[PDB]
Ligand binder design. Structure first.
Ligand SMILES: Nc1nc2c(ncn2[C@@H]2O[C@H](COP(=O)(O)OP(=O)(O)OP(=O)(O)O)[C@@H](O)[C@H]2O)c(=O)[nH]1
Ligand SMILES: [Mg+2]
Lengths: 161, 570, 151, 584, 124
């Protein structure tokens, strides 16, 4: 199953990829290109493309839309200043015909931080309830502790199997 | 590339031969691999034989000693029942330049002449001319081989035999004195190249042995007539230039139809016929009078082919059509081809001298040309005008004064030279314009071309002779400037004119005489078309198109007085 | 450094071309054609040192080559390169191709050109030559081939 | 890939349409899920780039291909990526993940393929982002990885010197790499780094000394000695240190190419050391002997390079170059024009008062054997240069010089005919002693001027006729048959020559008139003078009738002069003194 | 008569060389090159060029030059028209007169010039 994992820089995408794959919290730098791993969950294999989110390289996301079956959109739930920018990037992607059948898993990440917006708040900020003809789910997560990750994968595996 | 040469497989040898053929085509030295190729000389493969023999032809003169080592193979190959192999082997042994082989090639050439195959016979003629290029002293048995060969009836051999006879023995006329009738009978069916060669040699024989227009005179003319319509330009050209020298003047005019017809050919062929027509048009102008229009210049032709048409138009110029051509020539003057304009402007000048009636009418057109901006046209206009003012030495003040001021915008040395002479010659006719022009050029003297510097020293001396009152210092300066010049042609002017002018200390009678000789009326220049110089040569040869008696010229004589006995001809 | 690597037959048809300088595709074809015209007209007895054309960065650079069979192996080099060094480098390339392709010919350069690029790579890489001892070159080559056959 | 080659071979004249269809097929294949078909399309794209088609449209597809875990496809991807990416393609920013994965992986072969690909990705940004990893890889356990890595850090030094600043001690330490091939690559890296700023590598000279001494690989030797020649201008003492091991290598050299390269560098070192220490003429002679060994080689490349090197030692020390003699004039016969002209330059360097005779004689044999207007042109030009060098310094028998110029006059079609005429004029005006032989030869030319009229082109033989007719006129007192020469040069054949030639001919006609008139009147032969005047009153009009301007002026003036002088002679006036004074 | 033929491309180099008699170097084309340099274009070259020992008769058609070597006096338009007939033979065999066709079939070219020209004297 082809999964594209995108979101603003610093959201926690690379942390999530390697926590999912390796069961450890890895030290990262801002990803200039992409990382890729295949993760097996409940006997379904997901190839997850973790594509760098620095603004300069966001144009390159489009190179990964083709044949994508699932989108994981990771949000830094503590970053109120950039949550509208996250919404914009999400909606710009969802406008693409190539992705019209893709299912959308939103990870509302960094829930460990005391001022993190919760899943309900992030839902409002991203405008998810307005989406039409879209299979979507939002999951509160803390990538460093692992909390919420398998629940996200439960939904995604159910969508694609 | 040795290995596949001594490799047994014949296909490898054939590939090597093709590749070395390409090698020679690129001009590259493949002589080092000669021994391997000549080791393959005994091949039974016809294609490989041809290729190795071409290799031998190309590299025989390079590896002369090694070829000398392998001659026995060559004499053995001379008996090969294949005619082409025989010819190629004869060529190979001919190409070898050892002074000792000579008798071997004697036996080879006599056998080849005795050979029944016509191809071998013509290549034997080639062999004997090669021998004469090798040894002049063998000319006796060369001549006897020629005698045997000239008896053969075939035209294929006949052409080569005639060419060889011209190459080696131009003087032994009796051999053709026995076979002129055979040659003229065959010339109907002789091949076109043989047509050309036989026609030229028959032209020599007719000039040397026959007298003024004899049934044999008409027999040549009668049989040569159908070739006027031939597709070959050379046949038509040779037939045409034949009639120019042998046919009566009342019958030679017929060929003008074909000569014009030849002008529709490609560039190079029409280039030569234009030389031929231009020369022969001088003596008989009325012959191409009906075809004046076809000689009009088209813009599509390139520079020199256009130039040649103008020269013919000069010859065809006459009082009955001087007006028609002058109008047409003016149209060509403002053509974009500047070089063609230089030819056109000179063209109108010559016919203006030819037709004294139109001297002013052509002159009036010229002065308008002086106002145009093109440097080459104004440069070429003034010199053509200059030729016309000398021939009509009238006080054309209205013409010189326009010309005199025009100098300051002129850069061409020929034109700048042209300005100086007439104003000097007409110093008494424009005394108010001459003094400043010398002053103008005196300051700039060191920058002008050598040819101009010649005339500027002339201008001062003539100005000094007539108006020394106010130009004496200018003459002193212009003389002193040339005293220390670099170029040498001017130095003679400094030595010559000065002595006539300045040193009255040794003023003999001739010193008094300098004023009249410089101010003498200059005679009209007898302008000559560069084709009357070709009247000494037959039409259609290099000596015709190059105007020079180069190595091997087939010179014609004058027309003899009394006919040698035609009874021997039977 | 070497500026460009040029291989073509006697007819001018290219056979190996890898460049270490940024040149456009049309510039690449023009370089190939200029080199072919500059080289192929020369004799077999000519020195193989022809001053380079204008398509390869100026007169400072040089065209140096060797001809084997019907193949010209041209190395575009600067003035700091040893010209006889470049010739023997071409010779090493020729013998390496001979050993690896088992009597190489123009057919292997046509039909195995990626292998030829790889061979060039271990011989010279980034305008700078990597390995030059033929035996160790062949050991690296067939080690890579052992890798290929392994998986 | 092979099917594409077969199709292109089949579609010779239809290459464009077939290639466009194959490009569309490649577009379709590169967006497939399977990496095999897209990598085959990558092979075809590399072949198309070889043919000259834009490969850059599939940069992301190449990135997709190289992302494969299998090396079999990694090699194709990285090859097309080396041939495809450029500084103007930002898609290379998508390569970073795969590049880092293959760079940090411990595998040997994948790392090698990755670094081979990186050999052409060398941009400032990727250098900035991968220098930290390559500097870790510098001391990698495997030697082959180090061998490729040292070249890749060279590329990084090119595109990121901020890591040059610390790596230079690290690369100097790498200069002790135990693996010979890795050491050779490291020497190449450090040497080509030295080629740009050699001042920072003078202290590395002992390291390079040890490298060359311990090297058994002639390649390191050649390149490092070339870099020595490069650094030789900076410190002559280092070259003085080098001269002994270099000479030892020369003695032990079995590779003629290494021999050339090292001896040429040694000549450069001798140039550097000659500045104050002129006692290495023994090493110079050793170099000369080795250059001879090179020059007798039948290999034309070796031969040309030996010629160039001995030209260098010619501009350095001709005293041993002159030993060659035959060794060069034999090479003069070779089929290569460039080698031959360099040899002619060598003879020009070889010119002396004692050998000018023989060398010029052999070059005359060659001009008789010569072929080519550019060839014969430059040949006669440089003959004129060598004989006229330092104003005829090396010439002793000027009679020989005049004769050889006459032999040159046989060279039809030469463009320096004006130069040849200038040379005869110079030798005539400068040397009084040989004016007699000069005027004899030039009158002989005038006698055959009908044959010489075959070249009417400007700057041709007509200039020779110019000079000949002149110095016949100017030096007429030494003529033996003035009447014959005068009649021959009044012949109507001359009317076809170009203008100023005819003008100067008439100018010489009047000079010959003056000389012969003085001669006839001095003995009292009035009737002969009257006859000759009657001749030119019947001859000068054929000049008067011409079309050329200066010809018209000269002919008119001189015709009036001569005729009215005849009128004076009818009065019995000794006009000879006056006409002689006209040109004294 | 025609002892050699030199084909020359548009660039001014020796495109092809063949001989029937004593070989003369490709060098004799240098007079033709000088004539081209003095000529305004490829349509301003005089057909007749003189050399110290030979003579150069040249024609121009189909963007190629046919430079020939002539040693002694034989008629010019003869040589010109034979050169043009040889060019017509190129056109008849190849189908067009071009550099590429001759470069491809040099061997057939030399076969054809051997067939047309025999030891300097054209005859077929
Ligand atoms: N507090 C907290 N920090 C997290 C969490 N997840 C990731 N991070 C930290 O956020 C920072 C950025 O994480 P990355 O995974 O590099 O972010 P990214 O989305 O991959 O960023 P780009 O590579 O630029 O696209 C790192 O310092 C992570 O350790 C989380 O759940 N809680
Ligand atoms: Mg990341």
């Amino acid at each position: 199953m082809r999964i594209l994992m995108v979101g603003l820089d610093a959201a926690g995408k690379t942390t999530i990829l390697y926590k999912l794959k390796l069961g450890e919290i890895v030290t990262t730098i801002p990803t200039i290109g992409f990382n890729v791993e295949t993760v097996e969950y409940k006997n379904i294999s997901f190839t997850v493309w973790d594509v760098g989110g620095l603004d300069k390289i966001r144009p390159l996301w489009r190179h990964y839309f083709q044949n994508t079956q699932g989108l994981i959109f990771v949000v830094d739930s503590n970053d109120r200043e950039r949550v509208n920018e996250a919404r914009e990037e999400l909606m710009r992607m969802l406008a693409e015909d190539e992705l019209r059948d893709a299912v959308l898993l939103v990870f509302a990440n960094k829930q460990d931080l005391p001022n993190a917006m919760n899943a309900a708040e992030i839902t409002d900020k991203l405008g998810l309830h307005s989406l039409r003809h879209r299979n979507w789910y939002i999951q509160a997560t803390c990538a460093t502790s692992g909390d919420g990750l398998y629940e996200g994968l439960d939904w995604l595996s159910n969508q694609l199997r | 590339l040795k290995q596949m040469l001594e490799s047994n497989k014949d296909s490898a040898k054939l590939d090597a031969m093709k590749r070395i053929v390409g090698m020679i085509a690129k001009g590259k030295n493949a002589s080092e691999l000669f021994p391997a190729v000549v080791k393959n000389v005994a091949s039974k493969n016809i294609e490989i034989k041809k290729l190795v023999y071409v290799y031998l032809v190309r590299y025989a003169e390079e590896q002369q000693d090694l070829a000398l080592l392998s001659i026995s193979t060559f004499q053995r190959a001379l008996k090969d029942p294949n005619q082409l192999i025989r010819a190629s082997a004869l060529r190979v042994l001919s190409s070898i330049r050892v002074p000792i082989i000579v008798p071997i090639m004697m036996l080879a050439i006599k056998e080849a002449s005795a050979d029944l195959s016509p191809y071998v016979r013509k290549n034997a003629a080639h062999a004997i001319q090669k021998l004469y290029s090798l040894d002049p002293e063998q000319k006796e048995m060369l001549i006897e081989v020629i005698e045997k060969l000239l008896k053969d009836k075939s035209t294929l051999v006949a052409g080569s035999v005639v060419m060889a006879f011209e190459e080696v023995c131009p003087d032994r006329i009796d051999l053709i004195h026995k076979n002129y009738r055979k040659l003229c009978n065959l010339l109907v069916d002789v091949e076109e190249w043989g047509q050309v060669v036989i026609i030229h040699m028959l032209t020599r024989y007719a000039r040397t042995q026959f007298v003024s227009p004899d049934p044999d005179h008409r027999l040549l003319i009668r049989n040569t007539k159908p070739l006027l319509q031939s597709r070959n330009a050379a046949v038509v050209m040779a037939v045409a230039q034949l009639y120019w020298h042998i046919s009566p003047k009342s019958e030679a005019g017929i060929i003008s139809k074909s000569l014009v017809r030849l002008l529709r050919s490609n560039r190079e062929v029409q280039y030569i016929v234009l030389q031929n027509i231009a020369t022969m048009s001088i003596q008989r102008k009325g012959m191409f009078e009906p075809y004046l229009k076809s000689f009009y210049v088209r813009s599509t032709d390139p520079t020199m082919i256009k130039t040649l048409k103008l020269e013919i138009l000069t010859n065809l110029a006459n009082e009955a059509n001087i007006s028609t051509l002058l109008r047409e020539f003016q149209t060509y003057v403002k053509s974009q081809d500047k070089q063609f304009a230089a030819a056109t402007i000179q063209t109108i000048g010559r016919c203006a001298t030819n037709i004294l009636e139109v001297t002013d009418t052509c002159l009036n057109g010229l002065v308008c040309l002086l106002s145009n901006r093109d440097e080459i046209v104004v440069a070429e206009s003034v010199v053509v005008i200059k030729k016309l003012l000398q021939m009509q030495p009238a006080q054309h003040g209205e013409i010189i004064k326009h010309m005199a001021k025009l100098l300051d915008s002129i850069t061409v040395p020929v034109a700048r030279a042209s300005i100086l002479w007439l104003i000097g010659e007409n110093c008494e006719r424009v005394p108010k314009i001459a003094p400043d022009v010398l002053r103008k050029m005196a300051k700039s003297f060191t920058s002008e071309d050598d040819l101009v510097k010649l005339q500027i020293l002339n201008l001062g001396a003539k100005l000094y002779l007539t108006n020394s009152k106010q130009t004496k210092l200018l003459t002193q300066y212009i003389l002193n400037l040339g005293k220390y010049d670099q170029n040498y042609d001017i130095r003679d002017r400094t030595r010559f004119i000065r002595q006539l002018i300045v040193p009255n200390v040794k003023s003999g009678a001739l010193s008094k005489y300098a004023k009249k000789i410089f101010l003498a009326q200059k005679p009209a220049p007898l302008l000559e078309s560069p084709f009357k110089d070709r009247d000494h040569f037959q039409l259609g040869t290099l000596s015709h198109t190059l105007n020079i008696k180069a190595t091997g010229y087939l010179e014609l004589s004058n027309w003899p007085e009394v006919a040698p006995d035609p009874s021997v001809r039977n | 450094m070497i500026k460009a690597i040029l291989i073509f037959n006697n007819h001018g048809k290219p056979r190996l071309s890898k460049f270490y300088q940024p040149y456009s595709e049309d510039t690449q074809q023009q370089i190939i054609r200029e080199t072919f015209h500059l080289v192929s007209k020369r004799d077999e007895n000519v020195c193989n040192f022809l001053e380079g054309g204008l398509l390869i960065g100026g007169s400072d650079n040089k065209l140096i080559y060797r001809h084997y069979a019907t193949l010209y192996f041209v190395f575009c080099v600067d003035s700091s390169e040893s010209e006889l060094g470049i010739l023997d480098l071409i010779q090493v390339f020729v013998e390496t191709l001979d050993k690896c392709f088992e009597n190489v010919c123009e057919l292997d350069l046509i039909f195995h050109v990626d292998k030829v690029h790889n061979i060039l790579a271990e011989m010279v890489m980034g305008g700078m030559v990597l390995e030059t001892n033929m035996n160790e070159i062949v050991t690296q080559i067939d080690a890579q081939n052992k890798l290929e056959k392994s998986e | 890939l092979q099917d594409l080659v077969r199709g292109i071979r089949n579609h010779k004249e239809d290459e464009a349409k077939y290639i466009s269809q194959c490009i569309d097929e490649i577009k379709q294949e590169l967006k497939q899920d399977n990496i095999a078909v897209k990598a085959n399309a990558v092979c075809k794209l590399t072949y198309l780039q070889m043919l000259g088609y834009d490969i850059s449209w599939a940069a992301f597809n190449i990135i997709e291909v190289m992302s494969a875990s299998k090396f079999t496809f990694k090699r194709i991807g990285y090859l097309a990526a080396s041939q495809s990416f450029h500084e103007g393609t930002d898609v290379i920013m998508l390569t970073t993940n795969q590049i880092r994965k293959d760079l940090s992986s411990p595998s040997q072969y994948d790392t090698g393929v990755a670094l081979t690909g990186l050999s052409c990705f060398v941009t400032p940004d990727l250098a900035r982002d991968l220098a930290n990893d390559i500097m870790t890889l510098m001391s990698h356990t495997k030697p082959y990885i180090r061998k490729k890595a040292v070249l890749i850090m060279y590329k990084v030094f090119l595109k990121y010197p901020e890591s040059l600043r610390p790596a230079f001690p690290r690369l100097k330490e790498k200069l002790e790499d135990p693996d010979p091939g890795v050491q050779s690559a490291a020497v190449n890296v450090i040497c080509e780094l030295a080629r740009r700023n050699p001042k920072n590598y003078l202290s590395l000279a002992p390291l390079f000394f040890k490298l060359m001494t311990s090297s058994t690989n002639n390649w390191v030797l050649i390149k490092i000695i070339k870099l020595f020649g490069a650094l030789t201008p900076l410190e002559p003492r280092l070259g003085k240190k080098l001269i002994e091991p270099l000479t030892n290598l020369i003695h032990s050299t079995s590779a003629m190419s290494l021999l050339y390269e090292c001896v040429n560098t040694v000549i450069a070192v001798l140039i550097s050391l000659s500045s104050g220490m002129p006692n290495h003429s023994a090493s110079i002679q050793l170099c000369v002997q080795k250059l001879r060994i090179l020059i007798e080689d039948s290999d034309q490349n070796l031969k040309y390079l030996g010629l160039l090197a001995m030209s260098k030692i010619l501009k350095t020390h001709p005293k041993s170059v002159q030993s060659h003699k035959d060794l060069i004039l034999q090479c003069l016969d070779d089929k290569d024009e460039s080698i031959r002209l360099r040899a002619l330059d060598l003879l020009y360097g070889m010119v002396s008062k004692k050998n000018l005779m023989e060398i010029v004689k052999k070059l005359m044999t060659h001009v008789d054997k010569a072929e080519g207007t550019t060839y014969r042109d430059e040949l006669l030009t440089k003959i004129i240069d060598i004989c006229s060098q330092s104003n005829y310094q090396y010439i002793t028998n000027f009679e020989w010089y005049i004769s050889i110029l006459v032999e040159l006059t046989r060279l039809e079609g030469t463009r320096h005919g004006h130069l040849i005429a200038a040379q005869m004029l110079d030798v005539a005006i400068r040397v009084k002693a040989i004016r007699k032989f000069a005027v004899s030869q030039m009158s002989a030319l005038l006698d055959s001027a009908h044959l010489l009229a075959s070249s009417t082109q400007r700057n041709g033989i007509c200039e020779v006729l110019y000079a000949a007719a002149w110095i016949c006129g100017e030096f007429s007192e030494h003529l033996q048959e003035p009447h014959h020469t005068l009649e021959a040069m009044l012949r109507p054949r001359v009317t076809t020559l170009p203008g100023h030639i005819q003008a100067v001919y008439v100018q010489n006609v009047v000079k010959l008139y003056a000389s012969i008139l003085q001669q006839k009147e001095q003995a009292g032969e009035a009737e002969g003078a009257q006859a000759v005047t009657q001749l030119m009153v019947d001859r000068l009009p054929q000049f008067v009738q011409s079309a050329d301007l200066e010809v018209q002026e000269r002919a008119s003036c001189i015709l009036q002069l001569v005729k009215h002088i005849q009128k004076l002679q009818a009065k019995d006036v000794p006009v000879a003194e006056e006409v002689s004074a006209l040109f004294a | 008569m025609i002892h050699s033929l030199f084909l020359i491309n548009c660039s001014g180099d020796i495109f092809l060389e063949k001989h029937w008699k004593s070989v003369v170097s490709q060098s004799v084309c240098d007079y033709f090159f000088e004539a081209q340099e003095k000529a305004a274009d490829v349509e301003n070259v005089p057909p007749v060029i003189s050399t110290p020992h030979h003579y150069l008769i040249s024609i121009y058609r189909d963007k190629l030059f046919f430079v020939s070597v002539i040693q002694t006096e034989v008629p010019p338009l003869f040589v010109i028209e034979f050169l043009h007939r040889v060019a017509d033979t190129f056109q008849d065999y190849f189908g067009e007169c071009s550099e590429a066709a001759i470069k491809d079939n040099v061997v057939i070219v030399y076969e054809l010039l051997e067939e047309m020209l025999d030891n300097g004297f054209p005859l077929a």
